[PDB]
Each structure stands twice: as C-alpha cells, then as structure tokens.
Amino acid sequence: HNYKSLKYYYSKPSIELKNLDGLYRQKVTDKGVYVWKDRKDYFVGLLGKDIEKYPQGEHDKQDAFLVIEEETVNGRQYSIGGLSKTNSKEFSKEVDVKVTRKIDESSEKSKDSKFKITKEEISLKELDFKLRKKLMEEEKLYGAVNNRKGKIVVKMEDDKFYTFELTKKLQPHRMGDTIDGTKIKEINVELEYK
Amino acid sequence: HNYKSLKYYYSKPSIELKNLDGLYRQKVTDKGVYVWKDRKDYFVGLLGKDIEKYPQGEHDKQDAFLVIEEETVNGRQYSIGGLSKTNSKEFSKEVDVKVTRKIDEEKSKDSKFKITKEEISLKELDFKLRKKLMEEEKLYGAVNNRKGKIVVKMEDDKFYTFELTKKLQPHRMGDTIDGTKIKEINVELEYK
C-alpha cells in the first residue's frame, strides 16, 4: 500500500482525550476496549502487546489518542491503539528535530527544528501521527507522489530508538506501544525527495 | 498465552465456505475484505502482507475458512485470515499424522489427515489439526495439556510450525501453502 493510503490516513484529524471517563475491557475475548469521555464513546482495538496492558475490567487514569478508522467496530467508531497512562503532573520537553533533505542524487540539506513532548507516557501512534503532520506542513511530505520517502527516528536517552518509515502507514500492532516521553532525547528525520 | 484463550478459540466451530459468491476489497484503505456466499456476508481481516493478495476490487474463485470473532465489523460477523484460491481441479491426499509424546515412552500414534484443497490457509490447517488433537489426544482438556507443536512438512523439506502453547498469530492466519505439496504432519505432545 502506498501514496493514496498514506495521504488518506495522515490527513485525518486526531482526537486527543485526556483523563478518559472510562476505559473498559468488557471481556477477555474482546480484542479491544470501550473508551469514553463526556458523551462520546469508541471501541479501541488492542492489536499488539497493548492487549496485555488492559485485562478484563475498568482502567483509571488513562489517555486516548484517536484517529477514526474507516470501519465501524461493535457498532462504534473505531480507532487502533493510542492508549496510555495520563500525566501525573504537567510535562513539556522540547527536543531537537534534525531534518536531512534531498537536494539531488549527490547532495542533501540539513535543517533543524523543535518538537514538544507533552506526555510522560506516549504512544507510538501519537508520535508517528504528530511528526508526520509536522512534515506534511513544513516539508511537503505527501504533497506529491514522489514525496513519500524517508524515515523518522526517535532516539531515547540510552541506546534505544524507534523508527517510522514514511513509505508505509504505522502498523496496527505498533500503535499501542508506549515509551517514556521524559526519556526521548532527539528526533532525526531523513527525507529522500526533492 | 494461557490455556483459557487457547481453549476458547480452538473450541469454536468453523464455517467453511467453498466457492464464495464474492470477495471484495472496497477501498484500498480497508484492512480486510468482504466475503459472501448465499445471502450471508462477512468481513475478513487480513494482517501484514496478506492484504496484498486482494487489491481494490472484486475477486472470484476464492474459498474462506471462517472462525467467528467476538467483534462485529461494519455490521457483519468477523473472522481473521483463512482465505484461499478455490480448487481448479479435484484433489485429495491422505497425509500421515505422527503423534509422539515427549515425556515418556518414544513411540508415535499414527493416523491420517485428508487434504482436499490445492491451496490451503495456515488458519485452516492449524485449526483442524488442533481440533483433531483435542478430540484424540486430550489437547486443552486440562490446564497442563497445552505444550508441544505441530509441524507441517512439505515434499522439499520446507516446513510450517504451530506451537501449541500459543494461538496461531493473526499475520500467519492469512498465509497459504500448496496443499498438493504437504508430505506429512509430525506432532510432539509434551504432556502426559
């Protein structure tokens, strides 16, 4: 799958729900949870290791980063992953974003920018979505069919990293993975298009 | 994962739909396809590269092996993987199944497994073979009866393994193999 799907998913708005009123794993055989805040409810798929994070019952102090999928599930609007523990305190860390952009087959230009991390525990879904939007706005990502190549690498304070490939949508089973936002050190982006 | 989720999936009945009336990938955005036969329609999920077998549009000459999930999707019953090309010719082969206990004395109890499809999903092989073991070898009959493996061996020694302590993974449910090239099935049970 390529340009058409990418431009389509990444052009959707997201819904950021902090301090959910509910996050309920009705039964162990459900591959998702019911989430709600105020008067809007959703079914959220747990398609990765996140299924182990929310066993049968109610779960308090959670946030949800939703991007409404095309399919209805259990008669509700559906989103995949994007669940995380809510902040125990206000948090905001600015990290460097190094962008390396193709000029031609021989050279590349380096530009620097910043990105703010406002959650203590953040899902890969949310990082991936926000960083690609940032690139759609500032670097013409998905502005043309040729503008789809490269990657985003989130580097942590230790040797760990996480990569988002610009040629494909983040995979469902990775959307529920979370990382410690307080330990994100820098973000490096390689854009392989003029 | 635990005995409870294993027993729950493999104790389900399957619905085998040969010669589907249709299979349809509606938008390229969708993460599965619609299948239907005789006024019943279903939505079938396809993970990873399994979705690439069915580009946007309608596809004929397909079979579906369905195990209904708890979720409804687009108002339809849902299943994961299990799609394959229907037979172009008649085919049937009785494959030896050799069951050995890896605990005590070791000797195998042998039986046969009938293959009738030229192209067969790992979902179907996995599901039918574990069901055969539940019926003949007490698989999942007690919490300690869940260790071992099933190995599907091909004519050229390629093989596919199903570990009995876990449910077949969703990305493998949509994988297909050549039914005509299955040579034998070897099972190891690690419970008494």
Ligand SMILES: CC(=O)N[C@@H]1[C@@H](O[C@@H]2O[C@@H](C)[C@@H](O)[C@@H](O)[C@@H]2O)[C@H](O[C@@H]2O[C@H](CO)[C@H](O)[C@H](O[C@]3(C(=O)O)C[C@H](O)[C@@H](NC(C)=O)[C@H]([C@H](O)[C@H](O)CO)O3)[C@H]2O)[C@@H](CO)O[C@H]1O
């Ligand atoms: C066809 C396809 O999509 N296959 C999936 C895998 O992607 C494919 O294979 C990998 C190796 C790459 O070549 C992909 O470009 C290729 O499409 C997928 O593997 C995961 O792919 C992503 C990028 O999409 C990434 O490379 C993952 O590697 C890391 C990462 O950089 O993100 C490697 C890091 O060391 C690791 N970090 C830590 C702390 O362990 C992370 C981390 O495990 C994940 O990011 C957490 O979600 O992964 C690579 O695993 C594969 C698994 O998602 O699924 C295939 O279907």
Ligand SMILES: CC(=O)N[C@@H]1[C@@H](O[C@@H]2O[C@@H](C)[C@@H](O)[C@@H](O)[C@@H]2O)[C@H](O[C@@H]2O[C@H](CO)[C@H](O)[C@H](O[C@]3(C(=O)O)C[C@H](O)[C@@H](NC(C)=O)[C@H]([C@H](O)[C@H](O)CO)O3)[C@H]2O)[C@@H](CO)O[C@H]1O
């Ligand atoms: C934690 C987890 O579930 N990880 C998944 C992998 O399983 C883990 O690692 C493997 C190597 C085993 O040790 C598992 O016990 C362990 O959970 C998973 O790997 C795939 O696991 C299955 C068993 O579940 C199997 O070993 C696969 O290897 C083979 C196979 O024997 O079936 C190796 C064969 O040579 C190969 N055959 C051919 C013709 O290439 C097959 C074949 O590719 C697949 O059967 C087709 O589906 O694979 C092993 O790859 C991994 C990939 O599915 O997912 C991890 O999440």
Ligand SMILES: [Cl-]
């Ligand atoms: Cl529905």
Ligand SMILES: [Cl-]
């Ligand atoms: Cl990715």
Ligand SMILES: [Cl-]
């Ligand atoms: Cl890097």
Ligand SMILES: [Cl-]
């Ligand atoms: Cl397995």
